[PDB]
Amino acid sequence: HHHHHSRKTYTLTDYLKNTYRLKLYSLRWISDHEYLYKQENNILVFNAEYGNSSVFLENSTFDEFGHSINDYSISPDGQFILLEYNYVKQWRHSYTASYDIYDLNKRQLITEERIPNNTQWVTWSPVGHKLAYVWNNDIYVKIEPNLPSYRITWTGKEDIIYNGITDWVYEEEVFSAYSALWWSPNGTFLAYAQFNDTEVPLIEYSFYSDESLQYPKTVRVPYPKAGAVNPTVKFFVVNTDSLSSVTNATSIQITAPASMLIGDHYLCDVTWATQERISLQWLRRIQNYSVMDICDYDESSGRWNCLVARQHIEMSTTGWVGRFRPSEPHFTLDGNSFYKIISNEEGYRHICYFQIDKKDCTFITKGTWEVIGIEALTSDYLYYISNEYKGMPGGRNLYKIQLSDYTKVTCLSCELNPERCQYYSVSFSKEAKYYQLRCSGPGLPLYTLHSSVNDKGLRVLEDNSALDKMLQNVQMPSKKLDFIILNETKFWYQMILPPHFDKSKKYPLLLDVYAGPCSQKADTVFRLNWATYLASTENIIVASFDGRGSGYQGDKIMHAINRRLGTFEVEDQIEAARQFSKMGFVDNKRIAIWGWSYGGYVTSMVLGSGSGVFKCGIAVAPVSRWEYYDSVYTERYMGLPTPEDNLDHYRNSTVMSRAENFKQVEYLLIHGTADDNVHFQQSAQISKALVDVGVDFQAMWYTDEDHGIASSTAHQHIYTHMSHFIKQCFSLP
């Protein structure tokens, strides 16, 4: 006699075997009215207005191909499909692959002049079917799919010269992409960055590979640690229409402004404005100063000209520029002005409207909230995501502002489903006539289609009802999203609360931490994760706290840890736990902390703080000292580890110096051996320091795993392993 009461919990196996699956609705806009979607491996084309679909491309087309196709890409004109196979992952975004081109009209594979194996990047022009690809660090262009390539660059050299692709740090920390190729709107010009790593030092580490490898391999990666010599960058633009088979291509260099060339600098943004106008943003190595160049194409010269009167300066007195880099501009059609997120006089990030020839911009939004991103720009409206609604920094809604009247702002997503939907992102059609809304929480994910004409809902794309159905009799956790006042400042936290939560009880608590610069761990997003299992099955509250340094709440909070990582952010996680225990439903004796990456650093710094608050903790791929980590991320917040700059705090903020204090806690330290991002080195130095003061701890290396510890088997193993560690620390049987 169960009486249909929910007696199921969300278990670890549920998480690891993916029993309860979030359905997505992933589309690709090809026009201003149609999109593509995979139904049952068939590519269906969808008419956005009527909802009717036809099979665009059947799954039973490339079976004869003889290869497993990883992905595809259709040319803007709908005439060719790029088939991506032999995918081999490199870093977070980089990979190599083989490519074939299928003629969608002739219905045949192109067999002449095929894109080579081991291609590093491939991209169609934004219109028609021109191809640019990078192979062996050089850029090639095909005007037609079956025609010989034109080689654009002749200088590419493995690990040294990168043409059209980023090196390690630029991929990870600047562009969040491997691509460094930018086609102009109508595909006339192909702009590209060239990176130079000649004197960048190499991180070297063992890769053991399949057990059949007799001798381990040494992987060597140009990787600049804090203060080390950085890659240099050049920028070019080539006219693809004046290419020739008898003469080499002329790439016109756009040099960085003089303000940048006087020291180490970065290219931090490339954005085409018009057919013949490009904007470049450059960044000083000390990342409080950036210059946007705006460069026009001179017809008679065939060259590019950045008038110093169109240079725009963005700088910060309180910190670095932008959230992680200076924001991207959104140009009006004539390219004579643009909209950009910058922080205002109060430190809040808002949309500023700039004329191309004017220093002072006007802010079109304002308030004690922040604009997250500019999503679309038409001649009448600008569409943007912000956390204004209900003054919740961890919410996200789409708004549109009338360009001719800034007092006329409408929220497009706010009232659609207020209880289920408080975290939206958006996908606009080619000229913003339609948009897909994607709501991520706090309810189950919800994908809907809309016409921007009168903002009416067209249809529900995915409502996750099959999962809703599965979860009916599961004892699921809830989320509490709220704030505490500390030094008259709101600080947000979330708690994943076990089912049938009772404030009379004392629960064990796991502090799930990131706490890196511009991090946000308290939000309205619905997640099915390890925290879900721990609350649902193990009755642990999993809490996260956004303290000083956290993002989306202004620079006063964000810039608070400037030049000072390993301080207030660490301090606020500890204080959070004090506050959490003070709420009366937390077991003071069973409070734990864990994090990955920056969160691993904070976990390690907290556990070594001597606070006495935390019983135990798990650091996964943590930073241990800032000199070990990459220059662009680290120097953004820390400056240079030189005696003239910030070496003292580089030295004061290592986890190693806190080793003695680990005698008070139970510690699990986890690192993948092939971690190219935070090097295994970092945890190897933690372990050695812990051994040297005689502190016992738990450790787990993951052979050949990288920063993600993302292999199917390793993912399952680490979470199983951490689960045992937490259950044991909490005396859970």
Ligand X SMILES: CC(=O)N[C@@H]1[C@@H](O)[C@H](O)[C@@H](CO)O[C@H]1O
Ligand Y SMILES: *[C@@H]1O[C@H](CO)[C@@H](O[C@@H]2O[C@H](CO)[C@@H](O)[C@H](O)[C@H]2NC(C)=O)[C@H](O)[C@H]1NC(C)=O
- Residues forming the active site: 597, 675, 707
Choice between 19 and 117, CB closer to ligand Y: 117
Of the ranges 87-95, 286-294, 501-509, 717-725, which one interacts with ligand X (CB under 6 A)? 286-294
Q: What angle do CA 319, 325, 330 make, to 5 degrees?
A: 125
**535 three-state secondary structure:** helix
Contact string 606-645 vs ligand T22 (x = CB under 6 A) = -----------------x-----x---x------------
Q: Are 631 and 264 in contact (CB under 8 A)?
A: no
Of the ranges 65-73, 143-151, 553-561, 590-598, which one interacts with ligand T22 (CB under 6 A)? 590-598
720 binds, among a copy of itself, ligand T22, ligand X, none (CB under 5 to 8 A by kind): a copy of itself
Of the ranges 110-118, 336-344, 429-437, 452-460, which one interacts with ligand Y (CB under 6 A)? 110-118
Contact string 644-663 vs ligand X (x = CB under 6 A) = ----xx-xx-----------
DSSP 8-state symbol, 697? -
The CB-of-172 to ligand T22 minimum distance in angstroms stands at 5
Question: Does residue 314 interact with ligand X by CB under 6 A?
Answer: no
Question: Does residue 377 interact with ligand T22 by CB under 6 A?
Answer: no
Question: Does residue 262 interact with ligand X by CB under 6 A?
Answer: no
DSSP 8-state symbol, 537? T
Nearest Cα to Cα of residue 230 among 253, 267, 200: 200
Residue of minimal Cβ distance to ligand Y = 117
Out of 124, 223, 598, 637, the only residue in the binding site for ligand T22 (CB under 6 A) is 598
Contact string 513-552 vs ligand T22 (x = CB under 6 A) = -x-x------------------------------------
599 binds, among ligand T22, a copy of itself, ligand X, none (CB under 5 to 8 A by kind): ligand T22
Q: Give CA–CA dist 166/180, Å, rounded.
A: 6
The CB-of-648 to ligand X minimum distance in angstroms stands at 4
Out of 56, 223, 324, 493, the only residue in the binding site for ligand T22 (CB under 6 A) is 324
Question: Does residue 660 interact with a copy of itself by CB under 8 A?
Answer: no
Question: Does residue 458 interact with ligand X by CB under 6 A?
Answer: no
Choice between 34 and 328, CB closer to ligand X: 34
Q: What does each C-alpha distance from 626 to 226, 630, 638, 647, 678 come to in angstroms?
A: 7, 8, 8, 10, 10
Of the ranges 114-122, 172-180, 414-422, 544-552, which one interacts with ligand Y (CB under 6 A)? 114-122
Out of 66, 643, 694, 733, the only residue in the binding site for a copy of itself (CB under 8 A) is 694
- 257, containing H or E segment: none
Assigned token pair, 37: 């979607």
703 binds, among a copy of itself, ligand X, ligand T22, none (CB under 5 to 8 A by kind): a copy of itself
Residue 509: Cβ within 10 Å count:
26
Q: Give CA–CA dist 265/232, Å, rounded.
A: 8
Amino acid at 34: E
Question: Does residue 111 interact with ligand X by CB under 6 A?
Answer: no
Question: Does residue 627 interact with a copy of itself by CB under 8 A?
Answer: yes
Assigned token pair, 534: 């721990």
Nearest Cα to Cα of residue 395 among 322, 494, 486: 494
Q: Give CA–CA dist 139/135, Å, rounded.
A: 7
Question: Does residue 289 interact with ligand X by CB under 6 A?
Answer: yes
**H-state helical runs in 401-451:** none
Of the ranges 39-47, 164-172, 376-384, 661-669, which one interacts with ligand X (CB under 6 A)? 39-47
Assigned token pair, 456: 């009416």
Question: Does residue 298 interact with ligand X by CB under 6 A?
Answer: no
Choice between 101 and 613, CB closer to ligand Y: 101
Q: Give CA–CA dist 701/7, Å, rounded.
A: 37
Number of residues that bind a copy of itself (CB under 8 A): 49
Question: Does residue 114 interact with ligand Y by CB under 6 A?
Answer: yes
Question: Does residue 198 interact with ligand X by CB under 6 A?
Answer: no
**374 three-state secondary structure:** strand
324 binds, among ligand X, ligand T22, ligand Y, none (CB under 5 to 8 A by kind): ligand T22
Question: Does residue 96 interact with ligand Y by CB under 6 A?
Answer: no
Q: Give CA–CA dist 212/14, Å, rounded.
A: 34
Q: Give CA–CA dist 146/325, Å, rounded.
A: 39
Contacts of 87 (CB under 8 A, 6+ apart): 70, 71, 95, 96, 97
45 binds, among ligand X, ligand Y, ligand T22, none (CB under 5 to 8 A by kind): ligand X
Q: Give CA–CA dist 294/331, Å, rounded.
A: 11
Q: Give CA–CA dist 668/423, Å, rounded.
A: 34
Out of 13, 19, 39, 117, the only residue in the binding site for ligand Y (CB under 6 A) is 117
Q: Give CA–CA dist 217/541, Å, rounded.
A: 43
Assigned token pair, 395: 């919410």
Residues in the chain: 733
Question: Does residue 685 interact with a copy of itself by CB under 8 A?
Answer: yes
Choice between 98 and 673, CB closer to ligand Y: 98
Out of 52, 111, 212, 454, the only residue in the binding site for ligand X (CB under 6 A) is 52
Q: Give CA–CA dist 25/563, Å, rounded.
A: 42
Of the ranges 35-43, 345-353, 410-418, 482-490, which one interacts with ligand X (CB under 6 A)? 482-490
474-500 core/surface letters (b: 16 or more CB in 10 A; e: else): bbbbebebebbeeeeeebbbbbbbbbe
Q: What does each C-alpha distance from 330 to 271, 288, 334, 467 come to in angstroms?
A: 8, 22, 12, 38
394 binds, among ligand X, ligand Y, ligand T22, none (CB under 5 to 8 A by kind): none
- 478, containing H or E segment: strand 478-486
Choice between 72 and 628, CB closer to ligand Y: 72
Choice between 524 and 634, CB closer to a copy of itself: 634
Q: Give CA–CA dist 573/512, Å, rounded.
A: 10
Choice between 464 and 654, CB closer to a copy of itself: 654
Of the ranges 111-119, 155-163, 372-380, 461-469, which one interacts with ligand Y (CB under 6 A)? 111-119
Q: What does each C-alpha distance from 35 to 74, 229, 454, 458 come to in angstroms?
A: 11, 45, 20, 14
Q: Are 489 and 521 in contact (CB under 8 A)?
A: no
Residue 721 has φ and ψ, to the nearest 5°, of -65, -50
- Which residues of this protein are in contact with ligand X, per CB under 6 A? 45-47, 50, 52-54, 114, 116-117, 154, 186, 188, 248, 275-276, 286, 288-289, 297, 315, 317, 486-487, 489, 548, 572, 575, 639, 648-649, 651-652
- Which residues of this protein are in contact with ligand T22, per CB under 6 A? 172-173, 324, 514, 516, 596-599, 623, 629, 633, 677-678
- Which residues of this protein are in contact with ligand Y, per CB under 6 A? 98, 114, 116-117
